[PDB]
């Protein structure tokens, strides 16, 4: 039961991982996630504002 995934590298490559312990806390760091969303802190307003239109 092995997992194969790509590894970080511009535009110019696989590694295998296996878990040996029965506790999920023993796994290695999952530092491959890159999803993000800044609208929570930058646009917390109630009514959406179009950049082109005047603010008020």
């Amino acid at each position: 039961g092995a997992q194969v995934s790509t590894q970080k590298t511009a535009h110019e490559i696989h590694y295998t991982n296996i878990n040996y312990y029965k506790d999920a806390a023993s796994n290695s760091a999952n530092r491959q996630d890159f999803t993000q969303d800044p609208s929570k802190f930058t646009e917390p307003v109630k009514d959406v504002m179009i950049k082109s239109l005047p603010a008020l």
Binding site: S26, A29, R31, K51
Partner: protein
């Protein structure tokens, strides 16, 4: 099912720049109103002509997982193999992350945290100076014991409490690789809290601040049976490395120097450094 083949996360590159030409219209992207508490979303393409550029930069290294995914010293202490004072032959440290400044400041940028922990121990020994040093001693061995809150606490190096039957412990011998373990999320709440603006008693009395929620236990270390003809001093360093991290409610980084290990007390500090005048640029 010999291979799972985890799908690619798909490198998320930053936004590109689109070509823009001369404009003359009633739209005014530049003008806005910060009174709304909304940060403007303008881009350089909206105020001057720009060429088309493909950006291959990525924000991989700025993730909270990577930002906090570095081991850092959190405590160091010394204990002697043999000495007159009983309290000086072993260490007793209440667990807390506020002792060392750098790691404290790093953590304090978020109000709440939830992560697994990876602990590593570095142990070194040295012979104390003295008039007579000629001796022969085999390799030393050390014991690390973790005592959850409310458990028995040893009072001397050779106490009965060192016979751990439920308390996890590690026996380590010098010359090998540093010891290591993994610790899951062990908070009674749903997340660790770096700050706590409240009291202990229901009548707004007693302890105040984050000291109230610190009940992680203790760590004890001793030489197993080493008792040299001459004193030998050892030092232990503890390193913490969060894993699988999640963070909430960011807060501004601290500015004033730390002064207490269990309080936010500080002294007023200037906002920043000064210069000759508002126009000086040299």
């Amino acid at each position: 099912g010999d291979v799972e083949e985890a799908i690619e996360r798909a490198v998320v590159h930053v936004a590109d720049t689109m070509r823009s030409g001369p404009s003359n219209s009633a739209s005014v992207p530049a003008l806005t109103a910060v009174e709304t508490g909304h940060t403007s979303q303008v881009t350089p393409s909206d105020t001057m002509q720009t060429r088309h550029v493909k950006n291959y930069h990525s924000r991989s290294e700025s993730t909270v997982e990577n930002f906090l995914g570095r081991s850092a010293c959190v405590y160091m202490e010394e204990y002697k193999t043999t000495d007159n004072d009983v309290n000086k032959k072993f260490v007793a440290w209440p667990i807390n992350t506020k002792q060392m400044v750098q790691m404290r400041r790093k953590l304090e940028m978020f109000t709440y945290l939830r992560f697994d922990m990876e602990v590593t121990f570095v142990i070194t020994s040295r012979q104390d100076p003295g008039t007579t040093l000629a001796q022969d001693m085999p390799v030393l061995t050390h014991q690390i014991m973790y005592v959850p809150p409310g458990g028995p606490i040893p009072a001397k190096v050779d106490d009965y409490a060192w016979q751990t039957s439920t308390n996890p412990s590690i026996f380590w011998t010098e010359g090998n690789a540093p010891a290591r373990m993994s610790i899951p999320f062990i908070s009674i709440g749903n997340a660790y809290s770096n700050f706590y603006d409240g009291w202990s008693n229901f009548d707004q009395r007693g302890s105040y601040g984050y000291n109230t929620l610190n009940n992680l236990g203790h760590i004890y270390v001793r030489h197993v049976s080493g008792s040299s003809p001459h004193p030998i001093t050892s030092t232990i360093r503890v390193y913490f490395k969060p894993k699988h991290t999640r963070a909430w409610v960011p807060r501004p980084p601290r500015l004033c120097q730390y002064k207490k290990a269990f309080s936010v007390d500080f002294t007023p500090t200037p906002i920043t450094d000064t210069r000759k005048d508002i126009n000086t640029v040299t």
